[PDB]
Amino acid sequence: IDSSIRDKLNTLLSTTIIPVVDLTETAEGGAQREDLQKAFTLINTIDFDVENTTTTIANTPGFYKVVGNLSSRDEASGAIAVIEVTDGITTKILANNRIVSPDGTTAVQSVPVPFDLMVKLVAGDTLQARSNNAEVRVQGIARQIADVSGNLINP
């Protein structure tokens, strides 16, 4: 054997094919399929509907699924609605509503702008929804999918 393989083997820890049966799943407590395990429930759902304020979705470590819509405005509009992740020093917008660019009119129709995110927060991070104006709203739901170590949280 001459190989990267020794390297992966190193980090992580023949000519007869061996027939095996994998019992990880049952030893793990049974199978939990991704779509079911990520299900929203009444108790686990972080519902939000933010207009003219800043509202925390999550501020403790872990992985979060967050889906929803923002009120679209002209890209030059003064009315903003976003999902952003921040630590108070650096802030990054993960979903932006000022995206549309009408031509030849000041009558500007608006549509929802969908977002569907998986965000991982570590210590000191905050995932928040923000709207700076009563006319625009960040609406959606979120839930914790897993703890910061990656251990899955049952729905």
* Residues 71 to 100 in contact with Na ion, rule: CB under 5 A: 76
Residues between 101 and 140 with contacts to Na ion, criterion CB under 5 A: 134
How many residues bind Na ion (CB under 5 A)? The answer is: 3
Residues between 34 and 53 with contacts to Na ion, criterion CB under 5 A: 51
Q: Rounded to an integer, what distance in angstroms lies between the CA atom of residue 48 and that of residue 54?
A: 11
Beta carbon of residue 77, minimum distance to Na ion (angstroms, whole number)? 10
What one-character DSSP code corresponds to residue 11? H
Beta carbon of residue 11, minimum distance to a copy of itself (angstroms, whole number)? 8
Q: Which is nearer to a copy of itself, 54 or 96 (CB)?
A: 96
Query: Could you tell me which of 58, 31, 45, 30 has the C-alpha nearest to residue 121?
Result: 58
Which residues in the chain precede a discontinuity of more than 2.5 Å between C and N? 3, 13
Beta carbon of residue 53, minimum distance to a copy of itself (angstroms, whole number)? 14
Q: Which is nearer to Na ion, 9 or 134 (CB)?
A: 134
Query: Could you tell me which of 128, 103, 99, 94 has the C-alpha nearest to residue 111?
Result: 99
CB-based burial label for 92 (10 Å; 0-12, 13-18, 19+): exposed
Look at residue 153 and give the partner it binds from a copy of itself, Na ion, none, a contact being a CB closer than 5 to 8 Å depending on partner kind. none
Beta carbon of residue 38, minimum distance to Na ion (angstroms, whole number)? 31
Task: Give the interface with Na ion as residue ranges (CB under 5 A).
Answer: 51, 76, 134
